[PDB]
Structures are given as C-alpha cells and as structure tokens.
A paper describes a structure:
A highly specialized RNA polymerase with an outstanding accuracy is the CCA–adding enzyme (tRNA nucleotidyltransferase) that adds and maintains the triplet sequence C-C-A at the 3′–end of tRNAs. Recently, we could show that the CCA-adding enzyme from Planococcus halocryophilus (PhaCCA), a bacterium from the arctic permafrost growing at –15 °C, is such a cold-adapted enzyme and catalyzes CCA-addition in vitro down to 0 °C. Interestingly, both the N–terminal catalytic core as well as the C-terminal tRNA–binding region are adapted to the cold, indicating that the psychrophilic features are not restricted to a single protein domain, but are distributed over the whole enzyme. Our results reveal that a combination of individual strategies – a global flexibility in the tRNA-binding C-terminus as well as a thermal adaptation in the highly conserved catalytic core motif C controlling interdomain movements during CCA-addition – contribute to the remarkable cold adaptation of this unusual RNA polymerase. The crystal structures reveal a globally conserved scaffold with local adaptations to provide the structural plasticity compatible with catalysis at low temperature.
An ensemble of five structures was determined under cryoconditions, in apo state or in complex with a substrate in the presence of various salts. Fast crystal soaking (30 s) with CTP or its non-hydrolyzable analog prior to cryocooling readily led to the binding of the ligand in the enzyme’s catalytic site. When the PhaCCA crystals were soaked with CTP or a non-hydrolyzable CTP analog, the diffraction patterns of the resulting co–crystals revealed an orientation of the bound nucleotide that is identical to that found in the corresponding GstCCA/CTP structure. Hence, the shape of the nucleotide binding pocket with the base-recognizing residues EDxxR of motif D does not differ between the thermophilic and the psychrophilic enzymes, excluding a prominent role in temperature adaptation. A comparison of the apo enzyme with the two complexes shows that CTP binding does not involve any conformational change and the substrate is almost accommodated in a key-and-lock manner. This is in agreement with the very low RMSDs between the different structures. In contrast, soaking or co–crystallization attempts with ATP were not successful. At 4 °C, the Km value for ATP incorporation is 64-fold higher than that of GstCCA, suggesting a strongly reduced binding affinity for ATP, in accordance with the impossibility to soak this nucleotide in the crystalline enzyme.
Numbering used by the authors: -4 to 83, 94 to 373
C-alpha cells in the first residue's frame, strides 16, 4: 500500500509523548487495523489539552477546540488530536474514562505507539465474532446520543457484522429517542447505508430495531430492497424508495435535501412517469437524471451516446434569441418570445430546422 495516515499519527503520538503527554490511536483506525483494512481516518486521543497540542505542531486547524479537538496537519495528512473527554462536553483525566463512554466495543479500543492494544471492554473478541455491541450499558450509550442507535444499523452493513442481541433490544426500547436528533445527522447516516454493502440487511435491522416507527416518515423505508443496487450516489437510494412506493419527493422533504438533490430526484421521477423518451427528452433532462431514471426502471440504453448525438446540447447554442424575434416580428418584447423561442428550439433539436439564423428567420417569417 501507500497509506501515510497511520505513519503520520505515529509521529504525532511520538511528539506528544516526547513532551510528556500520553497519546494513543483510538476509534475506527484501531478497528480497521484489526480487520486488516486501511483506515479512512486515524484519530489520536491524548492527555494534552487543545492549546498544548497547538504548541507542539506548526500547522493546526482549531475549529473543534471547544470539543477538545485540534486537527494536526503534518506530512500532507490531517490527524485529529482530541483530549480525553466524554460527550453529552467534559474533559477527563484518563484514557479509560474516555473509552468507557464510546458507542461500541469495536470503536472503544486504543493502540499505543508500540502496537499494544488497550481493550477494556472486549472490542477484540467482538471484532473477531463480527458483533456490534454497545460499550457497557446500551441503555446508557443510546441515551447519551440517540444517533448511535442508527449508527449501529449503519455499521452492520458497512462491516457485515450483526448487532448484539442485548444492544438491539435496547434500540427497540429507546427508538423513540431518535425524534430528538437533528435531521441532518439522520440523513448523513442513511446516505451511508444507501451506498454500503449488505444494505438489505441494514434495512431489515432498521425495521426490526423499531427505528422505522419513529424516524421522520420512517414507514417509507419499509420497501422491498432486493432489486436495489447502489450506483455510489446515496441520492439513488432515496429515488428507489419513492419509486417503489409510487410516492413523490414531498413525502421525504423532512430530510432537508439540497436544491440540486431535490431536483435530481424530482426530474428522475418525471422521467420514470414519461411513457416514451425522444430527442427532446434527452435534450431537456441531464444525463444524470436520464441514467438514474433508467437505473430505477431497469433500462440499459446507451444514454450518453443518444444525448451526445443531438444537433445541439443546450439553449446557449441556439442561433437566434428573443431580440431577433422582436426585429423580425415588429412586435414589442413580451412573454410570447419564450413560446416562440421554444418552438424554434424543438425544431432544431429534432433536426428539422437548421440551427442557422437566416434559415430560422425564413421559418419564422413564414410561421408568424
Ligand atoms: N455518536 C458517536 C460518534 C462517534 N463516536 C466515537 O468516535 C469515534 C470516531 O467516529 P467518527 O464519527 O469520527 C467516524 P465513524 O462514524 O466511526 O465511521 P468510520 O470510522 O468507518 O469512518 C468512533 O470510533 C466512536 O468511538 C461515538 O462514540 N459516538
């Protein structure tokens, strides 16, 4: 491989310890190393306080300082250094105090500079058995942050693990608490589930855990997911969900999509409702919308080639505009222009009228 994150984190730990502080790799990096995977991120936990970290490193980003977190920039990587803490934020004085309030045992391990695993809650055994289990009392972990309930669902698909039975029954009992979680955090976890492996298992856990009873419009996630295959874009999960149920975008708008996301969903839904697609269809809709609609209805056409082979790609290529029509018509500017521009546009897109000012003028003077 060519990873640098672990190496950089080792250097960060070394500098922290050279200055008298304790420092360890924590979080998913430890889980990933034990799974033989290359970590996406490597967090460091330290007895150093944020301003003490800033003294030791030339380049830091300080946005999370209130939470105890300094981002250390080193060797072209960024390592998050967080003081021992628990969230609710309270700084604490030992590693174990920090670890004992984390969500799941596989996420509550630490590793030293010398590769020793500190695993007070059996993270290694659960990792080996492929079990997502809350640290300590699950009722406690889920009251501290109800989003953890949904995180457990997400990890089951992402790692192909099961959810520990006691933990899962705890989620069932506290699923109501999900109502307090910012919808942006909910959407972020669901977007991950939609692109992760084993997503059908994640969706069955979502239902079995009772989360679908209390998530915003939670019942809508209970569709048949067998024929869903992610395209790497979480948006396709939301469109698949709606299409399977013959529902419209407004039914999921609680999740606070961006305008472009919403447009992509709404336009794709339109395409799936349109009986037959022709040149104007391929002209007016984006490739991304055409491809997502094709994906969700099961078509496999070579969409890109059809769009590319149209006479023009967009309105900016049109050889005529409203002010040419004002000249030829002798009429004052008004909404009629858009009507007539579109007539001309259609004729060009269907390859009937040449995209040529003088020939469009001929057509117009004859039609008007
Ligand atoms: N609610 C939470 C959120 C986080 N944590 C703890 O913070 C660490 C970093 O999570 P993180 O959010 O920074 C990345 P993660 O979500 O684990 O996915 P990835 O590693 O596959 O990229 C996790 O390992 C948990 O121990 C927690 O105890 N309760």
């Amino acid at each position: 491989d060519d990873d640098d994150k672990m190496n950089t984190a080792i250097k960060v730990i070394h500098t922290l310890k050279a200055a008298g502080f304790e420092a360890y790799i924590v979080g998913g990096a430890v889980r990933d190393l034990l799974l033989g995977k290359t970590p996406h991120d490597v967090d460091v936990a330290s007895s150093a306080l944020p301003q003490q970290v800033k003294v030791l490193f030339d380049r830091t980003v300080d946005t999370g300082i209130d939470h105890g977190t300094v981002l250390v920039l080193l060797d072209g990587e960024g390592i998050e250094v967080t003081t021992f803490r628990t969230e609710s934020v309270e700084f604490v004085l030992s590693l174990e105090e920090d670890l004992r309030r984390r969500d799941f045992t596989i996420n509550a391990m630490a590793m030293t500079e010398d590769l020793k695993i500190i695993d007070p809650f059996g993270g290694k055994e659960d990792l080996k058995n492929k079990v997502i289990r809350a640290v300590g009392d699950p009722d406690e972990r889920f009251e501290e942050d109800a989003l953890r309930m949904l995180r457990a669902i997400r990890f089951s698909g992402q790692l192909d693990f099961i959810i520990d039975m006691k933990t899962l029954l705890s989620i069932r009992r506290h699923a109501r608490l999900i109502r307090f979680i910012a919808v942006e955090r909910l959407k972020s976890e669901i977007d991950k589930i939609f692109v992760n492996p084993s997503m059908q298992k994640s969706m069955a856990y979502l239902k079995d855990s009772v989360l679908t009873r209390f998530l915003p419009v939670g019942g809508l996630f209970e569709v048949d997911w067998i024929t869903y295959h992610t395209d790497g874009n979480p948006t396709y999960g939301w469109l698949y969900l709606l299409h399977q149920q013959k529902r419209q975008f407004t039914d999921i708008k609680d999740y606070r999509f961006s305008n472009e996301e919403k447009r992509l969903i709404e336009k794709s839904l339109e395409l799936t409702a349109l009986n037959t697609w022709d040149q104007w269809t391929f002209y007016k809709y984006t490739l991304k919308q055409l491809e997502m609609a094709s994906r969700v209805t099961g078509k496999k056409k070579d969409l890109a080639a059809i769009k590319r082979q149209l006479p023009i790609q967009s309105r900016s290529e049109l050889a005529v505009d409203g002010w040419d029509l004002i000249e030829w018509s002798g009429a004052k500017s008004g909404p009629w222009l858009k009507v007539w521009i579109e007539k001309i546009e259609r004729l060009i897109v269907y390859g009937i009228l040449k995209n040529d000012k003088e020939l469009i003028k001929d057509w117009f003077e004859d039609e008007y």
